[PDB]
Amino acid sequence: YLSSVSSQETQGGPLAPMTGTIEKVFVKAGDKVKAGDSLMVMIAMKMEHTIKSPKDGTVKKVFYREGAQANRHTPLVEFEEE
Amino acid sequence: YHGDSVASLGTQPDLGSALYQENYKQMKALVNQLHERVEHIKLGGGEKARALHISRGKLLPRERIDNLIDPGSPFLELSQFAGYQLYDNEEVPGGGIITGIGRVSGVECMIIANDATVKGGAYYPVTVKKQLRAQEIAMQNRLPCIYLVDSGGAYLPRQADVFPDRDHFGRTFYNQAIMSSKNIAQIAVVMGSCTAGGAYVPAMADENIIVRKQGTIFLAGPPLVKAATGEEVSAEDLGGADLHCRKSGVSDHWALDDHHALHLTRKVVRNLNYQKKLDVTIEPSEEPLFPADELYGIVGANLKRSFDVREVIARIVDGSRFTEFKAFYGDTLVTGFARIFGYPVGIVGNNGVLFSESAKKGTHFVQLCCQRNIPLLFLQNITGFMVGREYEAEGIAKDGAKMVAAVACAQVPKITLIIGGSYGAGNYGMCGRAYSPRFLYIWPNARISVMGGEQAANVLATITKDQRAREGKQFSSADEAALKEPIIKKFEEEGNPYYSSARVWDDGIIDPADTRLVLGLSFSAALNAPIEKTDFGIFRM
Amino acid sequence: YHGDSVASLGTQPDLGSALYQENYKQMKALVNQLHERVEHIKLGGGEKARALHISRGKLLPRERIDNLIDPGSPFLELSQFAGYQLYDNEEVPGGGIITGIGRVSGVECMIIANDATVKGGAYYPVTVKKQLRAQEIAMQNRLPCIYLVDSGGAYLPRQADVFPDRDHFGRTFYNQAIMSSKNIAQIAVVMGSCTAGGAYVPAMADENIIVRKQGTIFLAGPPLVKAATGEEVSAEDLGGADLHCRKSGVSDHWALDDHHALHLTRKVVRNLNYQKKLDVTIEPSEEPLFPADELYGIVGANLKRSFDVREVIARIVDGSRFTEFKAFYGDTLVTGFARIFGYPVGIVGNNGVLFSESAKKGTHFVQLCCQRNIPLLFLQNITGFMVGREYEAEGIAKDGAKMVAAVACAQVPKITLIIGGSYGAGNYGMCGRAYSPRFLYIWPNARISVMGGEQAANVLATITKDQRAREGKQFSSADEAALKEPIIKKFEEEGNPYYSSARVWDDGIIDPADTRLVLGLSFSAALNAPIEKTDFGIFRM
Amino acid sequence: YHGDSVASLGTQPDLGSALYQENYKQMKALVNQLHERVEHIKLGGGEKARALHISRGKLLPRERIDNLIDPGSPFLELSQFAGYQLYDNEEVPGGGIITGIGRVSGVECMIIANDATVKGGAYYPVTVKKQLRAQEIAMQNRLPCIYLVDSGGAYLPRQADVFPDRDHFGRTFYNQAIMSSKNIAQIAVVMGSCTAGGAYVPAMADENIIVRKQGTIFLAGPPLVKAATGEEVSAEDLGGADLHCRKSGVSDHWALDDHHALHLTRKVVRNLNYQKKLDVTIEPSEEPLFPADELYGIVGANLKRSFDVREVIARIVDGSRFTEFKAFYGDTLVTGFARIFGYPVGIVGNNGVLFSESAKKGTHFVQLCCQRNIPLLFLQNITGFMVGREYEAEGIAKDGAKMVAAVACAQVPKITLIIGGSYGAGNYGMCGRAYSPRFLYIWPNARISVMGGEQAANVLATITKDQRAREGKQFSSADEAALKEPIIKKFEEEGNPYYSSARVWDDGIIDPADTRLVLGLSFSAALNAPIEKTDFGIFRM
Amino acid sequence: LNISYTRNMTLKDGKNNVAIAVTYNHDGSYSMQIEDKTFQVLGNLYSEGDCTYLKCSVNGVASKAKLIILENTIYLFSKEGSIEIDIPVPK
Ligand SMILES: CC(C)=CC(=O)SCCNC(=O)CCNC(=O)[C@H](O)C(C)(C)COP(=O)(O)OP(=O)(O)OC[C@@H]1O[C@H](n2cnc3c(N)ncnc32)[C@@H](O)[C@@H]1OP(=O)(O)O
Ligand SMILES: CC(C)=CC(=O)SCCNC(=O)CCNC(=O)[C@H](O)C(C)(C)COP(=O)(O)OP(=O)(O)OC[C@@H]1O[C@H](n2cnc3c(N)ncnc32)[C@@H](O)[C@@H]1OP(=O)(O)O
Ligand SMILES: CC(C)=CC(=O)SCCNC(=O)CCNC(=O)[C@H](O)C(C)(C)COP(=O)(O)OP(=O)(O)OC[C@@H]1O[C@H](n2cnc3c(N)ncnc32)[C@@H](O)[C@@H]1OP(=O)(O)O
Ligand SMILES: O=CCCCC[C@@H]1SC[C@@H]2NC(=O)N[C@@H]21
Ligand SMILES: O=CCCCC[C@@H]1SC[C@@H]2NC(=O)N[C@@H]21
Ligand SMILES: O=CCCCC[C@@H]1SC[C@@H]2NC(=O)N[C@@H]21
């Protein structure tokens, strides 16, 4: 714990942070994504949240289209592992 | 043994004197104008707004207050003139809110009710000031608060004067929480939709009552939700009494309509389990020996003339009995002991310019009253404060400071009434607003300013002339007139009682004939809280 | 035993990132602009006024403060931007008064000095507000007050905003008397002529020092005496240190010049017989592990982007050591324990929108800190407050009310710092001005409003459109634009940090690189008073 | 003003329903059995023992109590079933001691009288427990104690359970001394010979009364003196009222017989110089609107069926008036305000399984009652505590902890009544014995256990099966039956009200038709002590 | 303060609901408006024996009658007529 080697042990998949409009979508239905790749940019309550790519896996499909309302904690991208 | 015969104050005025006739006429005209303006304010926001409000099946705020308090009980409304011509083109009757002290289930309570007919209940800065003043009064006098909430949140165009500062909208929630922590009951009745901000009021209250399909609590309204997040939802599904009672838990009681909500509020106030206890001696009440309307003749409307404050004292105290203290020292100040509705009071009134002896006498009397735990009543009629080389050599300012410190450090209930002028540091020395009296009322003939208009004009003219002479520049008489006249006009406008009451600088303008009654009520409301001991600073001898 | 190795916060930022470069550039430009404006304010009232002031043999107020405090001691000046563009055509540098916290004779003291070069020391409304804020800080933190009095009384043209109300000029004397009654020393040094009102300040002070031929106390100046009574007399004969010391008794010490007066003031402060006692645990101080200037890159000037508040925490706390509390619940709020200059602090900072879990976590942490008597530090960076149908069904407003009540009822010292946006009821929930923090500072990139400009414009447009539809009247798009654009512009102007600091809505704008230091000083000044027990209201579960 | 019409609870039950008939029959049988057992216990130790006791010219303990208290005054006896079948072959009626609350000289007092007909007044462990419980009640409610001492000391064969521990015989003297130090009067009347231990009771009492030739105080009896030292002496010469009054000074009053001793005790209680003061609001009493015997039909004896607790509330409160709080949130819990004999009470009762909402509502109501200083009444009818994965994810345990902490930290008088089942942590959450209620009564149909018998059997069977599977050993069904059946039988026996009342786990089993009356008495006895302020722990939001 | 309190009362005379506007005058009298007509009413209650009598003057016409209020009903017994008035019950 002191060395913080196991600090980053937690892993998870992408999810919607909040309920609000979706400003932009950067992920196609079928594509290969790398680490840190922007998935979607969502504007809610005078604040823009950018969703990063968790792993390097390819995307099977996207769930939300341009300018849609996405509820909080809802899947956005069907994501494959590394 | 209380059978000793005691001489009484008061003399029969000369009703045939022309001065009495003129003074009576002027005061009657002033009172009639005040009554007409009060009626127009009572009319409310407007006819169309009232019709729409009734069409929704809701009661007007004054009807709500009438049905809430005990039957036939008197109601003491505060700051009826808030917002009177305060804003250039917007009419805000009563400040858009109604604050008062009433009797619910035999308990003195502070009722604060939003007026939904004035801009949909939006909060103007004067509305926030009025609500904060009412909350401060309730805190000081330890009175339960009842908020009949029907508001549209802060008024957006004036947001810079409503949201951010210390004495702005957040102080309402701060006071609510603080008074909740001191076992002072908070009851919020949600009579209508609260868009935002007002949704916190039921949340922070000790007990809630909400109407079924009228009251709807939501942190952000459907327009605000659409603007911020974009989600679309109806008001009832966003708020609603059913949706709040059933799973949210915000609401504590569920009411069919306004009448049921008021009945539930009365039941809650009964269940409060509180009993008033008095820590002062009580004697049987007795009416004064002279009619109160004669004050119109005695006082009049012209401030240039002078009258004996003993006339007012004899017209307001019980049985016209008054025990003067140090009658011949500092004659310009009148200090003594009396009783109003059985409550003992120490009366301090002005009868001229304040001298060193008057300040010393006032300090001594304030010390005595604080020692004996007796409420204090101040009557301000200030021609000015004594100024002069021989007075400065005798420390007239230091005696004024003595009186100011004594008044400020006092802990007994203090009630101020401005029956005439109030200028300079004399206003501070006679328990002005800055010194936190429990109540402050003014008569329709009062005048309040830093000084007279002509005095300020002369001071400014002398300053400018001396500065120009030192610079070496000519200062013509036309410049003197151009400097003087606007100052005279501005000081004339800003001294009007209606100007001072539009802003919350007092608790209302009162008919002199009602004075006694009002005082009684106020003193009653002042006796709910226990009287603490008084700690004084350094008396600069 | 305090030898356990503990992990530290903070990560090394990417100095090569373009985002870091842009943020650093923007923040550096903002800081440079702030420094230039502060320099211009420090210049004073004007060159001719300064020359005249020096020609009278008097010291400028900043020189007085420098010669008063202990050598090399830091000075914490408050509200340097009061009056900045507050009035349309009048320039009032620093509000015409200088308030700060310094160290005199090893004792933390509040110095309030009038600036005679700004309109002859006349009191603008903002000057009264600044002095009242300084007096309130001294009262809360139990700090002796020193008034370097050189004033021309109230500013007559603005008298209606200076004289009559509760938070107006009389509150100064009220606070002076009250703090005198609580064994909080008041020392008044009369460095110059006081026309009126300011003459009461030495009278109500515990001890006085007056310069021989500069300081002159008189209730009414020769112009005022001429205007009121008509008597003609010179200023020295009306006031004067000799004429006051010898027979008036108002003055307590007699000084040859300003230097002698400051020496006497230091002697009095030494004779105060006071000793600071700490009621909190103390640990050796330690510097943070990262440079403070990197904050410029981390934070930047654009509020649309977001940053981790843990970076700021690691850059300000001692040794970058931080013990997070409930790290994974309510991740949008960061609560934990740290130490600043050895003082233990509980840090609560924003990392996103406030949810129900965040409010519950904040309430729990505030309860813990109040129980353990630990000072609280709030870091406001508020994107907004969560709103929505499912959140209203879960009582998001009621959780916000929980947090608001917990913050309001707290009795431990509270210090708020606004590092980003501050909108809506989130400002109330994070210890805004209305909730009486001991200090409140903002960074030069902050924004404060009731809500965003576009949100308010949309709300107003929707309200108007719905009202017109109900009435049956067309609401065109040109009307929408005419309603929206002025609201957008007004909200843009009123949110500026300089706009919020011109009025006394905070204690100054601070360079981020100085943040730590300022906090330290503030917390030191916050520890003079003992910490009382905390009484909470009803926790609406 | 208390003239508002208020709706009342209660509905007329269907007397023709077969369910009502069956429930009435079962409850009537239970009450008849209880009455017969109480009569047999009242008979006393035995016929020969009573004859011998009378032959010595002494009064039976119940006659002593009847002649001590005021005429016609009700007597509230506590723990009439202590020792009922507690020991295998020894019969100990009433635990060998009689404890109760009565009215002596207009003062509520706690009477503790030893029964000399049960093993010569020897102290069984249950006797010590009963006396300690009575002393604790007197300490909590600030009631004077009267000890009618006629005892043979500790029961030697059970000495290991009587002498050494903290809650053993020495705690009696400890409590006596402590209550003496708090100005709670102790009066000991030595009605008979005290062999040992009991000789300390008059010594530590504030005032003593001893009968001439019956009461004899000696530290060691003639048998004990012979066994320890060998000295031979008669009982009268070793003790005796003459030999104690004349030169020992242990005795304070000298009585001819029991009647004279009781008269002297009444005189002393009159000379106590005490006056009861009430710190709660009082309203005129009013009977309920429904007969109390109908409860027999409403409740019945079968715990599988469920009934509305509002029926019981309407049958016990004054005028059947009840103000429900948060009626629709957490419907499984019923919380509200009512009055019993004019005393205001906050009623919290169970109506189903405890959910998160019910726990939150209970915490809120307990906070309100503590804030307003209102006594609390709990009605336990617990089917269980809600458990499950979704409930654990929502912190059902943490909400139960909230309620438990709120109940534990309460300082207002608390009275618990178990009208049905009481299982699991719900018993703790509803003010069980461990949380120190002022009184605790159960109905003759209650059941108390850690959980149901079948639930415990299933838990144990699953544990054993999993352990055997992990070990790799077969676990047959015969083993399951052999593990289950004894557990079922034991849980059935240990849940009986008589089993729970044989040990001092409550203050007695009460006829439901008497419930109201008992509560009244208890609440009266609960109001002797002043109500202190309540300090709460950390509310884990 | 500065205005006169007006109370709206509803009374069910048999099967007809009637609304009365009662204005509380300063001198202790009342001004009752029922539809178009307005009336000046002033009276008091005095108890003789076990019977409470209302002595009232309406528009200058004086009278007295035994007054009993029981269960949402008001009974006035006089020497010229007996009057029963029903007080409406809230929902
Ligand atoms: C954090 C904190 C502490 C606080 C906040 O965040 S506060 C956030 C913003 N508030 C809301 O989000 C509530 C938005 N209202 C509404 O959702 C509704 O409107 C109701 C609920 C008010 C009912 O409305 P209603 O039934 O009374 O009718 P309406 O015609 O609408 O009533 C009059 C009309 O209201 C206009 N109007 C002007 N200013 C406002 C205003 N400030 N609020 C509402 N209405 C306003 C007025 O100009 C016009 O009349 P006019 O001047 O044209 O003649
Ligand atoms: C009850 C309570 C609580 C309070 C009171 O009752 S308060 C009563 C009234 N006050 C006095 O009675 C003091 C009157 N001053 C004086 O007796 C002197 O003047 C001194 C002492 C101020 C020294 O004066 P100084 O040596 O500093 O020079 P001066 O040029 O005079 O300084 C700048 C010039 O002062 C003009 N100026 C504008 N407003 C004021 C103002 N309010 N007071 C003074 N001067 C003012 C300014 O406009 C011009 O400059 P400008 O704007 O033209 O460039
Ligand atoms: C430090 C502390 C804090 C404490 C101590 O140190 S405690 C020291 C020891 N106690 C004494 O030293 C008192 C010894 N008693 C006596 O001096 C007398 O006996 C009297 C005074 C009790 C009057 O006696 P009595 O007139 O009531 O008649 P008795 O028949 O005697 O009454 C019934 C019979 O008593 C038998 N019996 C059984 N157990 C005891 C017991 N514990 N005490 C007394 N008697 C007991 C019973 O079994 C039999 O009847 P049974 O069961 O055979 O039917
Ligand atoms: O009050 C008005 C009379 C003329 C001015 C008197 C001045 S105002 C400044 C000073 N303070 C006082 O109380 N009186 C003088
Ligand atoms: O804070 C700005 C985001 C958009 C507005 C949110 C509103 S302001 C009224 C209400 N109170 C809050 O704290 N949030 C919402
Ligand atoms: O109460 C009996 C129902 C079945 C057992 C419920 C268990 S007992 C352990 C735990 N604590 C509770 O309050 N309920 C569960």
Side-chain angles (χ1 to χ4, degrees), chain E residues 41-60:
Chain E
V41 181
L42 56 165
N44 66 283
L45 277 186
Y46 65 95
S47 171
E48 48 170 22
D50 65 271
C51 303
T52 62
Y53 280 69
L54 166 79
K55 181 183 198 218
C56 64
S57 171
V58 177
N59 273 358

mmCIF file of all heavy atoms in Angstrom, chain E residues 41-60:
data_model
loop_
_atom_site.group_PDB
_atom_site.id
_atom_site.type_symbol
_atom_site.label_atom_id
_atom_site.label_comp_id
_atom_site.label_asym_id
_atom_site.label_seq_id
_atom_site.Cartn_x
_atom_site.Cartn_y
_atom_site.Cartn_z
ATOM 1 N N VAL E 41 -74.227 45.404 14.275
ATOM 2 C CA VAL E 41 -74.580 44.442 15.310
ATOM 3 C C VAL E 41 -73.624 44.614 16.479
ATOM 4 O O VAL E 41 -72.403 44.659 16.288
ATOM 5 C CB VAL E 41 -74.536 42.999 14.776
ATOM 6 C CG1 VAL E 41 -74.926 42.020 15.863
ATOM 7 C CG2 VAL E 41 -75.448 42.853 13.570
ATOM 8 N N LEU E 42 -74.180 44.717 17.685
ATOM 9 C CA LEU E 42 -73.363 44.803 18.890
ATOM 10 C C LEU E 42 -74.090 44.100 20.024
ATOM 11 O O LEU E 42 -75.272 44.362 20.257
ATOM 12 C CB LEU E 42 -73.058 46.260 19.272
ATOM 13 C CG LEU E 42 -74.178 47.282 19.498
ATOM 14 C CD1 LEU E 42 -73.618 48.499 20.212
ATOM 15 C CD2 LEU E 42 -74.844 47.712 18.198
ATOM 16 N N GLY E 43 -73.389 43.217 20.728
ATOM 17 C CA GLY E 43 -74.045 42.468 21.782
ATOM 18 C C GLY E 43 -73.048 41.848 22.733
ATOM 19 O O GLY E 43 -71.837 42.046 22.623
ATOM 20 N N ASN E 44 -73.587 41.085 23.679
ATOM 21 C CA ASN E 44 -72.776 40.437 24.699
ATOM 22 C C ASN E 44 -73.487 39.184 25.193
ATOM 23 O O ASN E 44 -74.654 38.933 24.877
ATOM 24 C CB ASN E 44 -72.472 41.387 25.862
ATOM 25 C CG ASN E 44 -73.711 41.761 26.644
ATOM 26 O OD1 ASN E 44 -74.508 42.591 26.208
ATOM 27 N ND2 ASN E 44 -73.881 41.149 27.811
ATOM 28 N N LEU E 45 -72.750 38.389 25.963
ATOM 29 C CA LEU E 45 -73.236 37.140 26.533
ATOM 30 C C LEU E 45 -73.258 37.261 28.048
ATOM 31 O O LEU E 45 -72.260 37.665 28.654
ATOM 32 C CB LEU E 45 -72.343 35.965 26.123
ATOM 33 C CG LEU E 45 -72.570 35.297 24.769
ATOM 34 C CD1 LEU E 45 -71.679 34.076 24.637
ATOM 35 C CD2 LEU E 45 -74.023 34.908 24.608
ATOM 36 N N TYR E 46 -74.387 36.915 28.661
ATOM 37 C CA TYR E 46 -74.472 36.899 30.115
ATOM 38 C C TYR E 46 -75.180 35.631 30.564
ATOM 39 O O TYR E 46 -76.169 35.216 29.957
ATOM 40 C CB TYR E 46 -75.190 38.142 30.656
ATOM 41 C CG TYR E 46 -76.643 38.256 30.260
ATOM 42 C CD1 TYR E 46 -77.649 37.796 31.099
ATOM 43 C CD2 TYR E 46 -77.011 38.841 29.058
ATOM 44 C CE1 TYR E 46 -78.978 37.904 30.746
ATOM 45 C CE2 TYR E 46 -78.338 38.954 28.695
ATOM 46 C CZ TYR E 46 -79.317 38.484 29.543
ATOM 47 O OH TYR E 46 -80.641 38.594 29.187
ATOM 48 N N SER E 47 -74.672 35.018 31.625
ATOM 49 C CA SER E 47 -75.185 33.742 32.110
ATOM 50 C C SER E 47 -76.005 33.974 33.369
ATOM 51 O O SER E 47 -75.500 34.529 34.349
ATOM 52 C CB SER E 47 -74.043 32.766 32.388
ATOM 53 O OG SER E 47 -74.517 31.604 33.045
ATOM 54 N N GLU E 48 -77.266 33.549 33.339
ATOM 55 C CA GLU E 48 -78.121 33.543 34.517
ATOM 56 C C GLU E 48 -78.535 32.108 34.799
ATOM 57 O O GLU E 48 -79.002 31.404 33.895
ATOM 58 C CB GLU E 48 -79.350 34.440 34.332
ATOM 59 C CG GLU E 48 -80.095 34.249 33.022
ATOM 60 C CD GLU E 48 -81.425 34.977 33.007
ATOM 61 O OE1 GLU E 48 -81.585 35.940 33.785
ATOM 62 O OE2 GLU E 48 -82.312 34.587 32.221
ATOM 63 N N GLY E 49 -78.354 31.676 36.042
ATOM 64 C CA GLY E 49 -78.562 30.274 36.356
ATOM 65 C C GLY E 49 -77.630 29.418 35.526
ATOM 66 O O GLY E 49 -76.415 29.642 35.479
ATOM 67 N N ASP E 50 -78.199 28.421 34.856
ATOM 68 C CA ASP E 50 -77.457 27.582 33.927
ATOM 69 C C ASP E 50 -77.636 28.005 32.476
ATOM 70 O O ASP E 50 -77.128 27.322 31.579
ATOM 71 C CB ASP E 50 -77.873 26.116 34.090
ATOM 72 C CG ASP E 50 -79.321 25.877 33.709
ATOM 73 O OD1 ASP E 50 -80.198 26.010 34.588
ATOM 74 O OD2 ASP E 50 -79.583 25.556 32.530
ATOM 75 N N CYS E 51 -78.339 29.104 32.219
ATOM 76 C CA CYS E 51 -78.697 29.503 30.864
ATOM 77 C C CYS E 51 -77.883 30.716 30.433
ATOM 78 O O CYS E 51 -77.839 31.727 31.140
ATOM 79 C CB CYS E 51 -80.192 29.811 30.772
ATOM 80 S SG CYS E 51 -81.266 28.452 31.287
ATOM 81 N N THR E 52 -77.254 30.611 29.266
ATOM 82 C CA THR E 52 -76.503 31.709 28.672
ATOM 83 C C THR E 52 -77.409 32.459 27.703
ATOM 84 O O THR E 52 -77.994 31.854 26.797
ATOM 85 C CB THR E 52 -75.255 31.197 27.954
ATOM 86 O OG1 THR E 52 -75.642 30.333 26.879
ATOM 87 C CG2 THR E 52 -74.365 30.429 28.919
ATOM 88 N N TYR E 53 -77.529 33.768 27.901
ATOM 89 C CA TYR E 53 -78.372 34.626 27.087
ATOM 90 C C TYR E 53 -77.497 35.576 26.284
ATOM 91 O O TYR E 53 -76.603 36.229 26.836
ATOM 92 C CB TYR E 53 -79.342 35.422 27.961
ATOM 93 C CG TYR E 53 -80.552 34.642 28.414
ATOM 94 C CD1 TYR E 53 -80.433 33.611 29.334
ATOM 95 C CD2 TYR E 53 -81.817 34.947 27.933
ATOM 96 C CE1 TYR E 53 -81.536 32.899 29.754
ATOM 97 C CE2 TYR E 53 -82.928 34.242 28.350
ATOM 98 C CZ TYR E 53 -82.781 33.219 29.259
ATOM 99 O OH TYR E 53 -83.887 32.514 29.676
ATOM 100 N N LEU E 54 -77.756 35.639 24.983
ATOM 101 C CA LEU E 54 -77.155 36.631 24.108
ATOM 102 C C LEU E 54 -78.070 37.845 24.060
ATOM 103 O O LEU E 54 -79.237 37.732 23.663
ATOM 104 C CB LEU E 54 -76.945 36.056 22.708
ATOM 105 C CG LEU E 54 -76.632 37.050 21.591
ATOM 106 C CD1 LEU E 54 -75.178 37.464 21.639
ATOM 107 C CD2 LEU E 54 -76.979 36.455 20.239
ATOM 108 N N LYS E 55 -77.554 38.992 24.491
ATOM 109 C CA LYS E 55 -78.266 40.261 24.410
ATOM 110 C C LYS E 55 -77.609 41.069 23.302
ATOM 111 O O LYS E 55 -76.445 41.466 23.428
ATOM 112 C CB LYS E 55 -78.223 41.004 25.742
ATOM 113 C CG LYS E 55 -78.965 42.325 25.742
ATOM 114 C CD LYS E 55 -78.811 43.039 27.074
ATOM 115 C CE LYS E 55 -79.872 44.111 27.252
ATOM 116 N NZ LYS E 55 -79.325 45.323 27.919
ATOM 117 N N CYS E 56 -78.343 41.302 22.218
ATOM 118 C CA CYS E 56 -77.765 41.893 21.023
ATOM 119 C C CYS E 56 -78.688 42.958 20.454
ATOM 120 O O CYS E 56 -79.915 42.847 20.527
ATOM 121 C CB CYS E 56 -77.491 40.828 19.954
ATOM 122 S SG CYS E 56 -78.972 40.018 19.314
ATOM 123 N N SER E 57 -78.078 43.985 19.872
ATOM 124 C CA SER E 57 -78.779 45.022 19.134
ATOM 125 C C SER E 57 -78.305 44.977 17.690
ATOM 126 O O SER E 57 -77.100 45.054 17.423
ATOM 127 C CB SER E 57 -78.527 46.403 19.741
ATOM 128 O OG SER E 57 -79.045 47.425 18.910
ATOM 129 N N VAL E 58 -79.255 44.841 16.769
ATOM 130 C CA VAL E 58 -78.994 44.826 15.336
ATOM 131 C C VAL E 58 -79.688 46.034 14.726
ATOM 132 O O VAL E 58 -80.916 46.160 14.818
ATOM 133 C CB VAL E 58 -79.481 43.527 14.680
ATOM 134 C CG1 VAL E 58 -79.249 43.572 13.180
ATOM 135 C CG2 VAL E 58 -78.785 42.328 15.297
ATOM 136 N N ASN E 59 -78.901 46.921 14.115
ATOM 137 C CA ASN E 59 -79.420 48.123 13.460
ATOM 138 C C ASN E 59 -80.298 48.938 14.406
ATOM 139 O O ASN E 59 -81.323 49.499 14.012
ATOM 140 C CB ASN E 59 -80.178 47.765 12.181
ATOM 141 C CG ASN E 59 -79.264 47.660 10.978
ATOM 142 O OD1 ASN E 59 -78.061 47.897 11.076
ATOM 143 N ND2 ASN E 59 -79.833 47.301 9.833
ATOM 144 N N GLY E 60 -79.891 48.999 15.671
ATOM 145 C CA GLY E 60 -80.612 49.761 16.666
ATOM 146 C C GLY E 60 -81.808 49.068 17.281
ATOM 147 O O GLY E 60 -82.489 49.675 18.116
#
